[PDB]
Amino acid sequence: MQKARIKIASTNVRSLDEVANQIKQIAERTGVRMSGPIPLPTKRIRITTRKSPDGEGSATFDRWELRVHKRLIDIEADERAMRQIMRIRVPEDVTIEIELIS
Amino acid sequence: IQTTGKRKTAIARAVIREGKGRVRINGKPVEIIEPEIARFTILEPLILAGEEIWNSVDIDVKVEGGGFMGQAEAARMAIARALVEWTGDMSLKEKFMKYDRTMLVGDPRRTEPHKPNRSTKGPRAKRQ
Amino acid sequence: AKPLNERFFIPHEIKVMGRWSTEDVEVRDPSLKPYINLEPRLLPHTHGRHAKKHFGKANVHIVERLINKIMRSGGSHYKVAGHFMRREHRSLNSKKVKAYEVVKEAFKIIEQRTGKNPIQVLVWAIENAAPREDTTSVMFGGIRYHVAVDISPMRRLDVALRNIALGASAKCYRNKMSFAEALAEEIILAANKDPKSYAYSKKLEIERIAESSR
Amino acid sequence: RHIVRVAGVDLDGNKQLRWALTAIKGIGINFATMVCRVAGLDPFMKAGYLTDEQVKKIEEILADPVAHGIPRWAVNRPKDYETGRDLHLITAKLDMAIREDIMRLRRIRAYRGIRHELGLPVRGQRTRSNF
Amino acid sequence: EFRYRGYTLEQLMNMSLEELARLFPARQRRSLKRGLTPEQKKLLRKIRLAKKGKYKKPIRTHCRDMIILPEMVGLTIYVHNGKEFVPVEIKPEMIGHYLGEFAPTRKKVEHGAPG
Amino acid sequence: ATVYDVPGDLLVERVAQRLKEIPEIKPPEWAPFVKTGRHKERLPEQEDWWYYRVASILRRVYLDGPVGIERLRTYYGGRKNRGHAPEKFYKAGGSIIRKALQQLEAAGFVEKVPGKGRVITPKGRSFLDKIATELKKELEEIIPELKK
Amino acid sequence: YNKRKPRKFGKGARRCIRCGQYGPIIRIQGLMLCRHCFREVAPKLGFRKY
RNA sequence: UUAAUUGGAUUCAACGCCGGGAACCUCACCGGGGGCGACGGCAGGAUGAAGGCCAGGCUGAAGGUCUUGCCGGACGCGCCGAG
RNA sequence: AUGCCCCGAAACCCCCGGGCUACACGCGCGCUACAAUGGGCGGGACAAUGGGACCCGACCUCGAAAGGGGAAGGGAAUCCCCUAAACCCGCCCUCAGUUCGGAUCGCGGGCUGCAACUCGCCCGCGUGAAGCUGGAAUCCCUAGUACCCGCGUGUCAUCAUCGCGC
Incomplete structure (x- = not known):
């Protein structure tokens, strides 16, 4: 057997969930065993910076963070099911990387 | 029967089955753990429960995270939940509550985030 | 590790530390009976929310309170005999496991010294090291004046415990002998009313002054 | 033996040998332990029962350290300035070598030598409020 | 007489740079191993020519990290510290140390009356 | 009984005296003159x-x-x-x-x-669990609770 | 002769995009931005305060 | 104090602050050297560069500088406004 | 961004070097250091902020070590960073300015980067300073909090005992 691992990565929660919903309904319409969406741990990239532009004032800093979420979908080999994922409307904030695994 | 234990960062997964009385901590016997206070914390939940139930069941616990204090206390928590779920004895839960409120409720306290102005020593540690 | 396993199996019958089951222990002074906890527990380490309870420190085991007062002892504005009681050498703060082992060995020393229950000696010393009067300042018309006061028993046991701990710690500090020895000497002195104890001497000096400030 | 003299430097026999050898300007705790291992004697064993044959054993150990099993690097001045080989430096010889190096840095007039001419930080240490 | 690792001035001179660097410290031998910059080689050519007698100019320089070699012994060169090219003379004892150690970049700091 | 069922310190102390006999394990010539770790402030x-x-x-x-x-x-x-x-x-x-x-x-x-890296052979497991069985048997009489 | 030497290393190898200051430049994933410049650009960058 | 420890910051509300990283750089401080004034007005122009070129003396040093000998084929020296 | 004013082959640009760390004292805040918990030997339970393509670098071997020769996997739940530390036990040393602490000198080696004596760190060596608890005075905090202990990321090749987050 063969299964495609689909990585869907986005900063926006709702667009990622929408793409996951689209893949879900695609898989359940195409009659393909699709291991449900597995959200991998969300990455929180954090950068700290002092707020005083000049050298004066008490030591005051802020931590600015980016939260990026990722989902993994294992979908069984169905070339009919694999032709239609290429028609998925991918928002600009979402990216999809599909690999094949025996 | 599977049981949980959450303490600080110590997560304990315990599984209790009928057996000779063997209890093992990540595959290690309870009596051999070199820190004595950790051994006593692990031992406490099964003392008051009774010696009969100490000899009646076998429990295997895998505890990850926290320190050896945290791991011992999470094993204690997991054993506490396992005893009540296995026996289902209200009196055991009641006397556990008398001995301690957190043996089935647990302590959801954690470490607070650190903050600017000498964060390293702590959140509230500031300059003189 | 054989005495360790022996001390691990002895207290299977709901016993504090490893031995000295507390049924034999007694409270003499009426003020400390409803404020000293003789509850049966293997360990004096509850991690409880007594800081979240106004008067929830009384429910803690007495030796747990003693372990606390031991681990609160180094460095302050508290200057006696011109000495900085400071532990720059593995400070006891937050290291409650040292504050468990050291106390266990100290209580062992008491057991082999007195031959009796060391908890009985401890309670006798607490009763003998608890003062009975103090002072306060009150002002009418801006003229201050000192008034004698009588302590609440909770603050009495607080000062007794802290004072015993400070006496032992000062004995230990910058000294050849160890801290367990210091505690073991101090509490046995306090048990039988020797002024050589810093605890009893401090009790006497704080009980006085208030004598004349009436 | 209350007083045991080795390499012309007296030591108290009450101290353990690994500690007894450290009294010499030119043996440390580590060096004392490894020369004790060279001699094969227990470093714990006190220095008061040191027969003179073991004293000479230690003397000739210090005479040529590399051949006795101590590697080439445990010495303080490997690749010695005037031989190019590895030799350990003890007491008076250390004094002469250090003075020769000081006079070397001075006669070249190095910044290191310049700071050695008056007593200042050679390796970047600061003295605004310090020293 | 002069001694360095068991070799005198001429005994050092007759040999190539490989063992000559093996006699030098780590900071000097390693830097020599990693090669010389375009302006170090040019200055070496200048001083070799001067020792031959071709380069009769009083030679000034700025390369402070220039490691003195025995071949440079017996010549006077002017090294830059930031303002001027202070004169220095190379004797046999200069071997194994940088040239930039030999120019005061900071004048003497003495103390006057406090404010 | 396995290495799990015995204290680590006692197992190491037991294994060292058995390894003493075999000649393959031997300190090199440079072992005593180098402290056990870079971090260490002292020789052992x-x-x-x-x-x-x-x-x-x-x-x-x-x-x-x-x-x-x-x-x-x-x-x-x-x-x-x-x-x-x-x-x-x-x-x-x-x-x-x-x-x-x-x-x-x-x-x-x-x-x-x-x-x-390096994994443990069947022979090494046999040696170690024989040692662990001997140690657990030794500790069983002193602590009967290890029989369980 | 009139050209600054290339520098792949050190503080001089980084000069901020916006303000051009040669000092604090965070390069997490290659922002290539000054610390004082990050305040005007963070909210538009999808950063959100929590 | 220095050539330089660049300068800023004044008790709370300056002093592990600008520096959230000084061996060239950082440089805002000092010593020394080289090079262009854009676009115009006045002036030269192909009458031959302003770009580089060896051997070298001054240059730390580099056709930068100059004796040396020259091309590459073309708009570029310079004063004022204004850069 | 930014008015006004100044200079305009300098106050423009660039090259080199020096300094940016210089000191008879004081200042603010941190790190160490003032022992017997201990110095040392072996063993054990133990995390995370996160980072990773001239990067993490597993892993093999040479070197005390920095690192030298090769290279798996990883554009990140799959591989590496990476071990956590505090701490307990079997045991030696038994209280002195030492079985503490290391400044400081010179030597050897490794790194980075054109180059680190000015102007780095580390693997070590003879080396190892004051310090045997500090005066009036005075700083901070109020529940998992204070404190103890450790960790990595950002600034970065090096440099902080910086700082932040855990």
């Missing part, structure tokens, strides 16, 4: 420290399976003072444990898996 006190190292390593190979030199440096690393700076962690020296692992391989107690 006793002269048997080499065997305790080897006896330690095998136990790790019994439990942690394929292991390399660097991870052994990290586990055997310790806390060193940096002077007026605070105390910080550092890894131990690699040559000592490399010689130890090489001698162990020459003893056959472990086998090299390239790209992963």
Whole structure:
């Protein structure tokens, strides 16, 4: 057997969930065993910076963070099911990387 | 029967089955753990429960995270939940509550985030 | 590790530390009976929310309170005999496991010294090291004046415990002998009313002054 | 033996040998332990029962350290300035070598030598409020 | 007489740079191993020519990290510290140390009356 | 009984005296003159420290399976003072444990898996669980609760 | 002769995009931005305060 | 104090602050050297560069500088406004 | 961004070097250091902020070590960083300015980067300073909090005992 691992990565929660919903309904319409969406741990990239532009004032800093979420979908080999994922409307904030695994 | 234990960062997964009385901590016997206070914390939940139930069941616990204090206390928590779920004895839960409120409720306290102005020593540690 | 396993199996019958089951222990002074906890527990380490309870420190085991007062002892504005009681050498703060082992060995020393229950000696010393009067300042018309006061028993046991701990710690500090020895000497002195104890001497000096400030 | 003299430097026999050898300007705790291992004697064993044959054993150990099993690097001045080989430096010889190096840095007039001419930080240490 | 690792001035001179660097410290031998910059080689050519007698100019320089070699012994060169090219003379004892150690970049700091 | 069912310190102490007999495990000529770790401020006190190292390593190979030199440096690393700076962690020296692992391989107690480290052979497991069974039998009479 | 030497290393190898200051430049994933410049650009960058 | 320890910051509300990283750089400080004034007005122009070129003396040093001998084929020296 | 004013082959640009760390004292805040918990030997339970393509670098071998020769996997739940530390036990040393602490000197080696004596760190060596608890005075905090202990990321090749987050 063969299964495609689909990585869907986005900063926006709702667009990622929408793409996951689209893949879900695609898989359940195409009659393909699709291991449900597995959200991998969300990455929180954090950068700290002092707020005083000049050298004066008490030591005051802020931590600015980016939260990026990722989902993994294992979908069984169905070339009919694999032709239609290429028609998925991918928002600009979402990216999809599909690999094949025996 | 599977049981949980959450303490600080110590997560304990315990599984209790009928057996000779063997209890093992990540595959290690309870009596051999070199820190004595950790051994006593692990031992406490099964003392008051009774010696009969100490000899009646076998429990295997895998505890990850926290320190050896945290791991011992999470094993204690997991054993506490396992005893009540296995026996289902209200009196055991009641006397556990008398001995301690957190043996089935647990302590959801954690470490607070650190903050600017000498964060390293702590959140509230500031300059003189 | 054989005495360790022996001390691990002895207290299977709901016993504090490893031995000295507390049924034999007694409270003499009426003020400390409803404020000293003789509850049966293997360990004096509850991690409880007594800081979240106004008067929830009384429910803690007495030796747990003693372990606390031991681990609160180094460095302050508290200057006696011109000495900085400071532990720059593995400070006891937050290291409650040292504050468990050291106390266990100290209580062992008491057991082999007195031959009796060391908890009985401890309670006798607490009763003998608890003062009975103090002072306060009150002002009418801006003229201050000192008034004698009588302590609440909770603050009495607080000062007794802290004072015993400070006496032992000062004995230990910058000294050849160890801290367990210091505690073991101090509490046995306090048990039988020797002024050589810093605890009893401090009790006497704080009980006085208030004598004349009436 | 209350007083045991080795390499012309007296030591108290009450101290353990690994500690007894450290009294010499030119043996440390580590060096004392490894020369004790060279001699094969227990470093714990006190220095008061040191027969003179073991004293000479230690003397000739210090005479040529590399051949006795101590590697080439445990010495303080490997690749010695005037031989190019590895030799350990003890007491008076250390004094002469250090003075020769000081006079070397001075006669070249190095910044290191310049700071050695008056007593200042050679390796970047600061003295605004310090020293 | 002069001694360095068991070799005198001429005994050092007759040999190539490989063992000559093996006699030098780590900071000097390693830097020599990693090669010389375009302006170090040019200055070496200048001083070799001067020792031959071709380069009769009083030679000034700025390369402070220039490691003195025995071949440079017996010549006077002017090294830059930031303002001027202070004169220095190379004797046999200069071997194994940088040239930039030999120019005061900071004048003497003495103390006057406090404010 | 396995290595799990016995205290680690007692198992190491037992294994060292058995490894004493076999001649393959032997300290090199340079062992006593180098302290056990880069971080260490001192040489080890006793002269048997080499065997305790080897006896330690095998136990790790019994439990942690394929292991390399660097991870052994990290586990055997310790806390060193940096002077007026605070105390910080550092890894131990690699040559000592490399010689130890090489001698162990020459003893056959472990086998090299390239790209992963060294794992424990059937013979090493037999030696170690025989030792553990003897230790557990020894501790059973003194502590009957280990019979369970 | 009139060209600054290339620098792949050190502080001089980084000169901020916006303000051009040679000092604090965070390069997490290659922002290539000054610390004082990050305040005007963070909210538009999808950063959100929590 | 220095050539420089660049300068800023004044008790709360300056002093592990600008520096959230000084061996060239950082440089805002000092010593020394080289090079162009854009676009115009006045002036030269192909009458031959302003770009580089060896051997070298001054240059730390580099056709930068100059004796040396020259091309590459073309708009570029310079004063004022204004850069 | 930014008015006004100044200079305009300098106050423009560039090259080199020096300094940016210089000191008879004081200042603010941190790190170490003023022992017997201990110095040392072996063993053990133990995390996370996160980072990773001239990067993490597993892993093999040479070197005390920095690092030298090769290279698996990883554009990140799959591989590495990476070990956590505090701490307990079997045991030696038994209280002194030492079995503490290391400044400081010179030597050897490794790194980075054109180059680190000015102007780095580390693996070590003879080396190892004051310090045997500090005066009036005075700083901070109020529940998992204070404190102890450790860790990595950002600034970065090096440099902080910086700082942040855990």
